[model samples]
Target: SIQAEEWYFGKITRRESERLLLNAENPRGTFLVRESETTKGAYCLSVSDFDNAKGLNVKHYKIRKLDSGGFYITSRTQFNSLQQLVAYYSKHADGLCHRLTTVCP
Candidate 1:
């Protein structure tokens, strides 16, 4: 017989601060970060900014896992609106794909 195991990962995208928040079972767990060349890079926003946001633009978010114990999340510039955030990610589908075995051992 075999046992089934699972893990829950939490992800949050904040456009106001241009950042992405990731939470996993273990802090030491391997993770990767990528972004669309058009958007440039993802930013790490402060919690306060996320609370008081009006609009969002050039921001997006997405997540993926590799074979190894590595995971990746891609994003765009960042924004203050949730709609824009989701929309941004929707446009760039391949920004957040990676192979964990290749980077982590």
Candidate 2:
């Protein structure tokens, strides 16, 4: 079993957390780091190099707001490209539509 780290990022509201986690809040290449709406949107990212990127809660490149409502964060890994990250998060979002200024493929 994996050991969960408590108090890692503490916590915050989705809307406010989004403002902090956003990478310049660009509406172009970015992704939802978490897989649930119960979160506070604290782990979003843009075109990151995966450095200090950790599993989540960290971001880089451009930033953008999620089309749906929520809070924030979780984690994902090994995504070498922006498009790939976008597609991965879109699928994870399921019913929530993630609108942006780029193509995923």
Candidate 3:
């Protein structure tokens, strides 16, 4: 399984993550992508933002990416591709699609 911290921070251990985050270059508006979750082949996108305590607030959203390059959700909705997901929600100030579009690492 792909971990959000590892994907976003590029650090595995808590100590390294802490050290990296302590710097002025701490990541913001970052994201992590995963193929697991064992839920209908869902693609997980984890968004990271800074907390008041200089930590991160990680929010995870599951997207079902189909083999045909289209995807869907619980709403019986289908997205042409992963990019569409971002396009739909890019209007929000702090959105996962926006994060995926600009800062997904």
Candidate 4:
């Protein structure tokens, strides 16, 4: 419901999302929310982070929708909207690969 959020890059493909996440200026933990290509009502949480083996990498996590009108990466951590979900993970990585830093710019 937070349409004013700049982080929600609607309908961007996985390739484009990865490219954005891999931007030189975007630091580790930078991320964005994008519509999922493989699902009707799902979204993706793409982040730029350093992996032990791969070094710097872009990671994607599926944001699944609950039947009761909520969004979540893991079932244990659900929110009523994408904005709330992002806000939650921004404070702590929780179950995500890394804590969110800045939105894709």
Candidate 5:
């Protein structure tokens, strides 16, 4: 189940998520998943990264849901489950700021 995954932190607020990622070791490229606060059934992918231009900061990407029950950050790239999405992004950053590296504790 998705809830069993350490990277999945359901129902946590954006602020709380940032703190968790910030406190994590080697914060760069670390990430976690959480339920969206504003929209029901929607989710978010939050990541910690240190860019030369932006420095150290967290980025949040809203994972949108299709009417058919698929999930995607960009419409062109979709997946059947949160885990599937996470796996794909980990291999390639694609539209994300950095590739998914470490899972936030």
Candidate 6:
């Protein structure tokens, strides 16, 4: 997970001890990342070379929002290339609907 306040950025993994775990006083948003064996209903990418102009391939993607301790998937997309995923994130990031310009993706 990533956390920040005004101008600082930090990273945290699930492996940290309880006392060392990063906590947010007033978290705006959170994104969970996980890997899958089969690309079934997931975003798959083949990043042969990070410098490639064309970019990787994205098989699928899903987005969910958290509310009252529950999650609701708001959108899903399938793509033949990763550029579409990048485009989607670029256009639909969290800040698009909020007054706070520092919103996270």
> Against the true structure, what is each candidate's TM-score?
0.21, 0.23, 0.50, 0.90, 0.90, 0.23
Clashes of each: 6, 9, 0, 0, 0, 0
lDDT of 2 by residue, 16-91 (tens): 4355444444333333332223533334332221223342232332222344532222222434433454555545
Q: Can you tell me which runs of candidate 2 are displaced by over 4 Å?
A: 1-10, 21-93, 99-105
Clash pairs, candidate 4, are none
Clash count (model 5, backbone only): 0
- Per-residue CA lDDT of model 6 for 1-105, tens digit only, reads 112232111232223211221233222212222222343333211111111463321111232322323222234343333333334443554322211122222
User: Candidate 1 lDDT (Cα, whole model)?
Assistant: 0.28
Task: Please provide, for model 1 over 1-105, each residue's C-alpha lDDT reduced to its tens digit, 9 standing for 90 to 100.
Answer: 001201111132343123322222212212222333243333221211111243222223343333332323432254444334334433543443211111111
Candidate achieving higher lDDT, 1 or 5: 5
| Top candidate, metric lDDT | 5
Model 5 TM-score? 0.90
Candidate 6's error at 35, in angstroms? 1.5
For lDDT, candidate 3 versus 5, the one ahead is 5
| lDDT value, candidate 4, whole model | 0.86
Q: Clash number for model 6?
A: 0
Ranking by lDDT: 5, 4, 3, 2, 1, 6
lDDT of 4 at 27: 81
lDDT of 4 by residue, 1-105 (tens): 655779988888999999888777778899988888989988888999876697778999999998898788888888988888888999998767789999888
